[PDB]
Coordinates of C-alpha atoms in Angstrom, one line a residue:
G1 CA -13.3 6.1 -23.7
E2 CA -14.8 9.5 -24.2
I3 CA -15.7 11.9 -27.1
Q4 CA -14.0 15.2 -27.0
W5 CA -15.8 16.9 -29.6
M6 CA -17.7 16.1 -33.0
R7 CA -18.7 17.9 -36.0
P8 CA -19.2 17.8 -39.9
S9 CA -16.2 16.5 -41.7
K10 CA -16.4 19.1 -44.1
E11 CA -15.6 21.7 -41.4
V12 CA -12.1 20.0 -40.9
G13 CA -11.7 19.4 -44.5
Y14 CA -12.8 15.7 -44.9
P15 CA -15.1 14.0 -47.2
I16 CA -18.2 11.8 -46.6
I17 CA -18.0 8.0 -46.2
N18 CA -20.4 5.8 -48.0
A19 CA -21.0 2.8 -45.5
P20 CA -23.3 0.3 -47.1
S21 CA -27.1 0.8 -46.1
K22 CA -28.1 -2.8 -46.2
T23 CA -27.1 -5.9 -44.3
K24 CA -25.5 -8.9 -46.1
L25 CA -27.0 -11.3 -43.7
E26 CA -30.1 -13.1 -45.0
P27 CA -31.8 -16.4 -44.0
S28 CA -29.8 -19.4 -45.0
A29 CA -30.9 -22.7 -46.3
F30 CA -31.2 -24.0 -42.6
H31 CA -33.2 -21.0 -41.3
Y32 CA -36.3 -22.7 -40.6
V33 CA -34.7 -26.2 -39.7
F34 CA -33.0 -24.7 -36.6
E35 CA -34.0 -22.5 -33.7
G36 CA -32.5 -19.1 -33.3
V37 CA -33.7 -15.6 -32.0
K38 CA -31.0 -13.4 -33.5
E39 CA -31.5 -10.9 -36.4
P40 CA -28.9 -8.9 -38.4
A41 CA -27.8 -5.7 -36.6
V42 CA -29.4 -2.3 -37.3
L43 CA -27.1 -0.4 -39.7
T44 CA -28.8 2.8 -40.4
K45 CA -31.2 5.2 -38.8
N46 CA -34.3 4.2 -41.1
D47 CA -34.6 0.6 -39.7
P48 CA -38.3 0.1 -38.7
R49 CA -37.3 -2.2 -35.9
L50 CA -35.8 0.8 -33.8
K51 CA -37.5 1.8 -30.7
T52 CA -35.1 4.4 -29.3
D53 CA -32.8 6.7 -31.2
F54 CA -30.2 5.3 -33.3
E55 CA -27.3 7.8 -33.2
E56 CA -27.4 8.1 -29.5
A57 CA -27.4 4.3 -28.8
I58 CA -24.2 3.4 -30.8
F59 CA -22.1 6.2 -29.6
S60 CA -23.3 5.7 -25.9
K61 CA -20.5 3.2 -25.6
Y62 CA -18.3 6.1 -24.9
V63 CA -18.8 6.5 -21.1
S64 CA -15.9 8.7 -19.5
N65 CA -12.6 8.4 -18.0
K66 CA -12.6 7.7 -14.3
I67 CA -8.8 7.8 -14.1
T68 CA -6.1 9.9 -15.8
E69 CA -2.8 8.7 -14.3
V70 CA -1.0 5.4 -13.6
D71 CA -0.8 4.7 -9.9
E72 CA 1.5 2.7 -7.7
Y73 CA -0.5 -0.5 -8.1
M74 CA -0.6 -0.2 -11.9
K75 CA 3.3 0.4 -11.9
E76 CA 4.0 -2.8 -10.0
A77 CA 1.6 -4.6 -12.4
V78 CA 3.6 -3.3 -15.2
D79 CA 6.9 -4.4 -13.8
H80 CA 5.7 -7.9 -13.0
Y81 CA 4.2 -8.5 -16.3
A82 CA 7.0 -6.9 -18.2
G83 CA 9.2 -9.3 -16.2
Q84 CA 7.4 -12.3 -17.7
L85 CA 7.5 -11.1 -21.3
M86 CA 11.2 -10.8 -21.0
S87 CA 11.6 -14.3 -20.4
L88 CA 10.3 -15.1 -23.9
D89 CA 13.3 -13.2 -25.3
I90 CA 11.1 -11.6 -28.0
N91 CA 13.0 -10.2 -31.0
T92 CA 12.7 -6.5 -30.6
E93 CA 13.8 -5.6 -34.2
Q94 CA 11.4 -3.9 -36.6
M95 CA 9.9 -6.2 -39.2
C96 CA 10.6 -5.6 -42.9
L97 CA 7.7 -4.3 -45.0
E98 CA 7.3 -7.6 -47.0
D99 CA 6.7 -9.7 -43.9
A100 CA 4.5 -7.0 -42.4
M101 CA 2.4 -7.2 -45.5
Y102 CA 2.6 -10.8 -47.0
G103 CA 3.1 -12.8 -43.6
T104 CA 5.8 -14.9 -42.1
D105 CA 6.4 -17.6 -39.4
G106 CA 3.7 -16.3 -36.7
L107 CA 2.0 -13.8 -38.5
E108 CA -0.7 -14.2 -41.2
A109 CA -0.7 -12.1 -44.4
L110 CA -3.1 -8.9 -44.5
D111 CA -6.7 -9.6 -44.7
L112 CA -7.7 -8.8 -48.4
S113 CA -11.4 -8.3 -47.6
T114 CA -11.5 -5.9 -44.8
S115 CA -11.7 -2.2 -45.2
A116 CA -8.6 -0.3 -46.6
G117 CA -9.3 2.9 -44.8
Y118 CA -8.7 6.6 -45.6
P119 CA -7.9 8.1 -47.9
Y120 CA -8.4 5.0 -50.0
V121 CA -12.2 4.5 -49.0
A122 CA -12.6 7.8 -50.6
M123 CA -10.7 7.4 -53.8
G124 CA -12.4 4.2 -54.5
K125 CA -9.2 2.2 -54.3
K126 CA -9.4 -1.2 -52.7
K127 CA -6.7 -3.5 -51.2
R128 CA -6.7 -6.0 -54.1
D129 CA -5.0 -3.1 -56.2
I130 CA -2.0 -2.8 -53.8
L131 CA -1.0 -6.5 -53.2
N132 CA 0.2 -9.6 -54.8
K133 CA 0.5 -12.8 -52.7
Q134 CA 2.8 -14.1 -55.6
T135 CA 4.8 -11.0 -56.6
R136 CA 5.0 -10.0 -52.9
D137 CA 5.5 -6.4 -54.3
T138 CA 6.0 -3.6 -51.8
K139 CA 6.8 -0.7 -54.2
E140 CA 3.1 0.0 -54.5
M141 CA 2.7 0.5 -50.7
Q142 CA 6.0 1.9 -50.2
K143 CA 5.0 4.8 -52.6
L144 CA 1.7 5.1 -50.6
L145 CA 3.4 5.5 -47.2
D146 CA 5.5 8.2 -48.7
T147 CA 2.4 9.9 -50.2
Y148 CA -0.2 9.9 -47.2
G149 CA 2.2 9.3 -44.4
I150 CA 0.7 7.7 -41.1
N151 CA -1.7 8.7 -38.3
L152 CA -4.7 8.8 -40.6
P153 CA -8.4 8.8 -39.2
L154 CA -10.2 5.6 -38.4
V155 CA -13.0 5.1 -40.8
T156 CA -15.9 4.0 -38.6
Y157 CA -18.4 1.2 -39.8
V158 CA -21.4 -0.2 -38.0
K159 CA -20.7 -4.0 -37.8
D160 CA -22.7 -6.2 -40.0
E161 CA -23.4 -9.2 -37.7
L162 CA -26.4 -11.0 -35.7
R163 CA -27.7 -9.5 -32.4
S164 CA -30.4 -10.2 -29.9
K165 CA -33.8 -8.9 -30.2
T166 CA -33.4 -6.3 -27.2
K167 CA -30.0 -5.0 -28.7
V168 CA -31.8 -4.5 -32.2
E169 CA -34.7 -2.5 -30.8
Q170 CA -32.3 -0.4 -28.7
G171 CA -29.9 0.0 -31.5
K172 CA -26.9 -1.5 -29.5
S173 CA -25.0 -2.1 -32.6
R174 CA -21.4 -2.4 -32.2
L175 CA -18.8 -0.2 -34.2
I176 CA -15.7 -1.0 -36.3
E177 CA -13.0 1.8 -36.4
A178 CA -10.9 0.5 -39.3
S179 CA -7.4 2.0 -39.5
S180 CA -5.9 3.0 -42.7
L181 CA -3.9 0.5 -44.6
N182 CA -0.8 2.8 -43.9
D183 CA -1.4 2.6 -40.1
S184 CA -1.9 -1.0 -40.3
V185 CA 1.2 -1.8 -42.4
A186 CA 3.2 0.4 -40.3
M187 CA 2.2 -1.0 -36.8
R188 CA 2.9 -4.4 -38.3
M189 CA 6.4 -3.3 -39.2
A190 CA 6.8 -1.7 -35.7
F191 CA 5.3 -4.6 -33.7
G192 CA 5.3 -7.6 -35.9
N193 CA 7.6 -9.5 -34.0
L194 CA 5.9 -8.8 -30.9
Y195 CA 2.7 -10.3 -32.5
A196 CA 4.5 -13.3 -33.8
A197 CA 5.9 -14.0 -30.4
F198 CA 2.4 -13.9 -28.8
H199 CA 0.9 -16.2 -31.6
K200 CA 3.6 -18.7 -31.1
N201 CA 3.3 -18.7 -27.4
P202 CA -0.2 -18.7 -26.3
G203 CA -0.3 -19.4 -22.5
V204 CA 0.5 -18.1 -19.0
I205 CA 3.7 -16.6 -19.9
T206 CA 1.9 -14.2 -22.5
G207 CA -1.1 -14.3 -20.6
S208 CA -2.7 -14.4 -24.1
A209 CA -4.6 -16.9 -26.0
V210 CA -4.6 -14.9 -29.3
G211 CA -4.1 -17.2 -32.2
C212 CA -4.5 -20.6 -30.3
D213 CA -6.1 -23.7 -31.6
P214 CA -8.8 -24.5 -29.1
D215 CA -8.8 -28.3 -30.0
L216 CA -5.2 -28.4 -28.8
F217 CA -4.9 -25.6 -26.4
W218 CA -7.9 -26.8 -24.0
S219 CA -5.8 -29.9 -22.8
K220 CA -3.0 -27.5 -21.8
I221 CA -5.0 -24.9 -19.9
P222 CA -6.0 -27.0 -16.8
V223 CA -2.3 -27.9 -16.5
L224 CA -1.1 -24.3 -16.5
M225 CA -3.8 -23.1 -14.2
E226 CA -3.1 -22.9 -10.4
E227 CA -5.6 -24.4 -7.9
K228 CA -8.6 -21.8 -7.7
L229 CA -10.0 -20.3 -10.7
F230 CA -11.7 -16.9 -10.9
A231 CA -13.3 -15.0 -13.8
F232 CA -15.8 -12.2 -14.7
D233 CA -17.2 -10.5 -17.6
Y234 CA -16.5 -6.9 -18.6
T235 CA -19.4 -4.5 -20.1
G236 CA -17.9 -2.6 -23.3
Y237 CA -14.4 -3.3 -22.3
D238 CA -12.7 -1.6 -25.3
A239 CA -14.6 1.6 -24.9
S240 CA -13.8 1.5 -21.1
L241 CA -10.1 1.8 -21.2
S242 CA -9.0 5.0 -19.7
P243 CA -5.6 6.7 -21.1
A244 CA -3.8 5.4 -18.1
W245 CA -4.0 1.9 -19.1
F246 CA -2.6 2.7 -22.6
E247 CA 0.3 4.5 -20.7
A248 CA 0.9 1.4 -18.5
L249 CA 1.1 -0.5 -22.0
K250 CA 3.6 1.9 -23.2
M251 CA 5.5 1.2 -20.0
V252 CA 5.5 -2.5 -20.6
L253 CA 6.5 -2.1 -24.5
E254 CA 9.3 0.3 -23.4
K255 CA 10.5 -2.1 -20.8
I256 CA 10.7 -5.1 -23.3
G257 CA 12.7 -2.9 -25.6
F258 CA 10.1 -1.5 -27.9
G259 CA 10.3 1.9 -26.3
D260 CA 11.7 3.0 -29.6
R261 CA 8.1 3.0 -31.0
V262 CA 5.5 3.5 -28.2
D263 CA 4.1 6.6 -30.0
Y264 CA 1.9 4.2 -31.9
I265 CA 0.0 3.4 -28.9
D266 CA -0.9 7.3 -28.6
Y267 CA -2.7 6.9 -31.8
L268 CA -5.0 4.2 -30.5
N269 CA -5.5 5.9 -27.2
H270 CA -6.3 9.5 -28.3
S271 CA -8.0 8.5 -31.6
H272 CA -9.5 10.6 -34.6
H273 CA -12.4 9.2 -36.4
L274 CA -14.7 9.5 -39.4
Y275 CA -18.4 8.4 -39.6
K276 CA -20.7 9.2 -42.4
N277 CA -20.4 13.0 -42.6
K278 CA -19.0 13.5 -39.1
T279 CA -15.5 13.4 -37.6
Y280 CA -14.6 13.1 -34.0
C281 CA -11.6 12.8 -31.7
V282 CA -11.8 10.3 -28.9
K283 CA -9.9 10.3 -25.5
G284 CA -9.0 6.6 -24.4
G285 CA -10.8 3.6 -25.7
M286 CA -9.2 1.0 -27.9
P287 CA -10.5 1.1 -31.4
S288 CA -11.8 -2.3 -32.6
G289 CA -10.5 -2.6 -36.1
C290 CA -6.8 -1.9 -35.7
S291 CA -3.7 -3.8 -36.2
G292 CA -2.9 -5.5 -32.8
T293 CA -6.2 -4.7 -31.3
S294 CA -6.3 -8.3 -29.8
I295 CA -2.8 -8.5 -28.5
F296 CA -3.1 -5.1 -27.0
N297 CA -6.4 -5.7 -25.2
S298 CA -5.0 -8.8 -23.9
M299 CA -1.8 -7.2 -22.8
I300 CA -3.9 -4.5 -20.8
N301 CA -6.2 -7.2 -19.4
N302 CA -3.0 -8.7 -18.1
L303 CA -2.1 -5.5 -16.5
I304 CA -5.8 -4.9 -15.2
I305 CA -6.0 -8.2 -13.3
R306 CA -2.7 -7.7 -11.6
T307 CA -3.4 -4.1 -10.6
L308 CA -6.8 -5.0 -9.2
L309 CA -5.0 -8.1 -7.3
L310 CA -2.4 -5.6 -5.8
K311 CA -5.0 -3.1 -4.8
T312 CA -7.6 -5.7 -3.5
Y313 CA -5.2 -8.1 -1.8
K314 CA -1.8 -6.6 -0.7
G315 CA 0.7 -9.3 -0.3
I316 CA -0.5 -11.4 -3.2
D317 CA 2.1 -13.2 -4.9
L318 CA 1.6 -12.3 -8.7
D319 CA 4.1 -15.2 -9.6
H320 CA 1.4 -17.5 -8.7
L321 CA -1.2 -15.9 -10.8
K322 CA -2.1 -17.8 -14.0
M323 CA -4.2 -16.1 -16.4
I324 CA -4.9 -16.4 -20.1
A325 CA -6.7 -13.5 -21.8
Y326 CA -8.2 -13.3 -25.2
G327 CA -8.9 -9.6 -25.5
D328 CA -11.4 -8.9 -22.8
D329 CA -12.3 -12.7 -22.2
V330 CA -10.0 -14.3 -19.6
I331 CA -9.6 -17.3 -17.4
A332 CA -7.4 -16.9 -14.4
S333 CA -6.4 -18.9 -11.4
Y334 CA -4.7 -18.6 -7.9
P335 CA -3.5 -21.0 -5.3
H336 CA -6.1 -19.4 -2.9
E337 CA -9.6 -18.4 -3.6
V338 CA -10.5 -14.8 -4.5
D339 CA -13.6 -12.8 -4.5
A340 CA -14.5 -11.7 -7.9
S341 CA -17.1 -9.1 -6.4
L342 CA -14.3 -7.3 -4.6
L343 CA -12.2 -7.1 -7.6
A344 CA -15.3 -5.8 -9.4
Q345 CA -15.8 -3.0 -7.0
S346 CA -12.1 -2.0 -7.3
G347 CA -12.8 -2.3 -11.2
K348 CA -15.0 0.7 -11.0
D349 CA -12.1 2.7 -9.5
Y350 CA -10.2 2.2 -12.8
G351 CA -13.3 2.8 -14.8
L352 CA -14.2 -0.9 -15.3
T353 CA -17.5 -2.4 -15.3
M354 CA -17.0 -6.1 -14.1
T355 CA -20.0 -8.4 -13.7
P356 CA -20.5 -12.1 -12.6
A357 CA -18.8 -14.4 -15.1
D358 CA -21.2 -15.5 -18.0
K359 CA -24.1 -13.2 -17.0
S360 CA -24.7 -15.1 -13.7
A361 CA -27.0 -13.1 -11.4
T362 CA -24.5 -12.8 -8.7
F363 CA -20.7 -13.9 -8.3
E364 CA -20.3 -17.6 -7.7
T365 CA -17.4 -20.1 -7.4
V366 CA -15.6 -20.6 -10.7
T367 CA -15.3 -24.2 -11.2
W368 CA -14.1 -26.4 -14.2
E369 CA -17.5 -27.6 -14.5
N370 CA -19.0 -24.1 -15.0
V371 CA -16.1 -22.1 -16.5
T372 CA -16.1 -20.9 -20.1
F373 CA -13.3 -19.2 -22.3
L374 CA -13.9 -18.1 -25.8
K375 CA -17.4 -19.1 -25.2
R376 CA -16.3 -22.7 -24.7
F377 CA -16.8 -25.1 -21.6
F378 CA -14.0 -27.6 -20.6
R379 CA -15.0 -31.2 -20.8
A380 CA -12.6 -34.1 -20.2
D381 CA -13.0 -36.7 -22.8
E382 CA -15.0 -39.8 -21.6
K383 CA -12.5 -42.5 -22.7
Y384 CA -9.3 -40.3 -22.4
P385 CA -9.8 -37.9 -19.2
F386 CA -6.4 -36.3 -20.0
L387 CA -7.8 -34.9 -23.2
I388 CA -10.0 -31.9 -22.9
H389 CA -12.8 -31.0 -25.2
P390 CA -13.5 -27.3 -26.1
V391 CA -17.3 -27.3 -25.8
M392 CA -19.2 -24.6 -27.7
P393 CA -22.8 -24.7 -26.7
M394 CA -25.1 -25.7 -29.7
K395 CA -27.4 -22.7 -28.9
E396 CA -24.4 -20.5 -30.5
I397 CA -24.0 -23.0 -33.5
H398 CA -27.8 -23.2 -34.1
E399 CA -27.8 -19.3 -34.1
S400 CA -25.0 -19.1 -36.7
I401 CA -26.0 -21.5 -39.2
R402 CA -29.5 -19.9 -40.0
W403 CA -27.8 -17.1 -41.7
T404 CA -25.5 -16.4 -44.5
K405 CA -23.6 -13.6 -46.3
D406 CA -22.2 -15.6 -49.2
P407 CA -24.1 -18.6 -50.6
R408 CA -20.8 -19.8 -51.9
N409 CA -19.1 -19.9 -48.6
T410 CA -22.0 -22.3 -47.2
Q411 CA -19.8 -25.3 -47.6
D412 CA -17.1 -23.7 -45.3
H413 CA -19.4 -22.0 -42.9
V414 CA -21.1 -25.4 -42.2
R415 CA -18.0 -27.2 -42.3
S416 CA -16.5 -24.7 -39.6
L417 CA -19.6 -25.3 -37.4
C418 CA -19.0 -29.0 -37.5
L419 CA -15.5 -28.7 -36.2
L420 CA -17.1 -26.9 -33.2
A421 CA -20.2 -28.9 -32.9
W422 CA -19.0 -32.5 -32.5
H423 CA -17.5 -32.0 -29.2
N424 CA -21.1 -31.9 -27.7
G425 CA -21.0 -35.5 -28.2
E426 CA -21.8 -38.1 -30.9
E427 CA -25.7 -38.2 -30.2
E428 CA -25.6 -34.4 -30.2
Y429 CA -23.6 -34.2 -33.5
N430 CA -25.8 -36.8 -35.3
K431 CA -28.8 -35.0 -34.6
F432 CA -27.2 -31.9 -35.9
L433 CA -26.1 -33.6 -39.1
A434 CA -29.5 -35.1 -39.4
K435 CA -31.2 -31.7 -39.4
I436 CA -28.7 -30.4 -41.9
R437 CA -29.2 -33.2 -44.3
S438 CA -33.0 -32.6 -44.1
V439 CA -32.6 -29.9 -46.7
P440 CA -31.5 -30.3 -50.3
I441 CA -28.3 -27.9 -49.7
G442 CA -27.3 -29.6 -46.6
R443 CA -27.5 -33.0 -48.4
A444 CA -25.0 -31.9 -51.2
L445 CA -22.6 -30.7 -48.7
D446 CA -19.3 -32.6 -47.7
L447 CA -19.3 -33.1 -44.0
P448 CA -17.2 -35.3 -41.8
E449 CA -18.7 -38.1 -39.7
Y450 CA -18.3 -38.1 -35.8
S451 CA -15.9 -41.0 -35.7
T452 CA -13.8 -39.3 -38.4
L453 CA -13.5 -36.0 -36.3
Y454 CA -12.8 -37.8 -33.1
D455 CA -9.9 -39.8 -34.5
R456 CA -8.1 -36.9 -36.3
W457 CA -8.5 -35.2 -32.8
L458 CA -6.7 -38.1 -31.1
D459 CA -4.2 -38.3 -33.7
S460 CA -3.5 -34.5 -33.3
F461 CA -1.8 -34.5 -30.0

């Protein structure tokens, strides 16, 4: 990820974008009943809590490109992984516009709330104006695809989410590059079946966990894993991807019968953006708000791990590599132990910043007792050990519950948190409910009791 040039949108014939100046996050009914050190992210240059410059901070995520081309290791990584994906026998056909828009088995319908992108965000035209979940009309879109084509700029928003005290004072706010509806729709027709295959097959064959149900999936993971687990964290993964990874991705796509439309990847790779009154071209780096971002990040992560293993451990048997990635987050295993610290060093060769798994000071052995995936620990059930609980630390939940974007969505936001919470144990869950019910709002909510959640869970297998 590296900016090639940047300048006023007017110079290249583009208008200005009105990204909202105020956060939607405000203290919830539970703000003072729970403990949390997070605050809404910095959105504009004006925020009094800023210590260092704002503009610089947000864009500093674009490092540079350490590699240009695809080497021998990467090529073999491509072969191996492409080889696995073929066993799924994925439908290489294109997906009709209807499904691409309003869903189908394996793919949810377009998110009616998220940004519509250029040129719509500049005409004041929203998504609710182009779609009907009941009419399932496509004449609207169809006309718009003919009118503004594809390959449109990515409108760039500052993400409205909670952040640590440090990251707020250093303006370390994350960016959302939202693709135009046209691009999103197009890509969905182009790769819909691929996405669906992935969602319907979370595991070690896809090497993906996208679209999984952790309550159920956790019990499968251990079985799918080889004897020795290894993991690490990435720093600014999306932005650190060099154009070469995208090439390898195209190679994979091409090998699985999608060669036909690998150009779409070029669009993600060598991207064109709009932010406020500026416009910039970016070389490398996966844009965050695009159709397929997760899946593609996950696919690349598969290639990354393989590449590093080939480089670092010549002779390795990739067929005995069991990994599951969700974007940059990953859980992997091998019959023999591996040294993540080595892999991290080889990582830098490919422009990758790999650090000890879960902010650990130094690389330590990964065990079922200390490993996390999607922020969750794995804890065998006390009564039925063959069933595994996805355990989200309470800290995370406490943080989340203290804020709110919409007072009407409180019922669901709390309800959601419970589905996460109860895995921490009955004593823990009850304390949580106790705290919730200490305030008028939380008392008027409709939440499930521990035993209820636990039974529904057992019944679910």
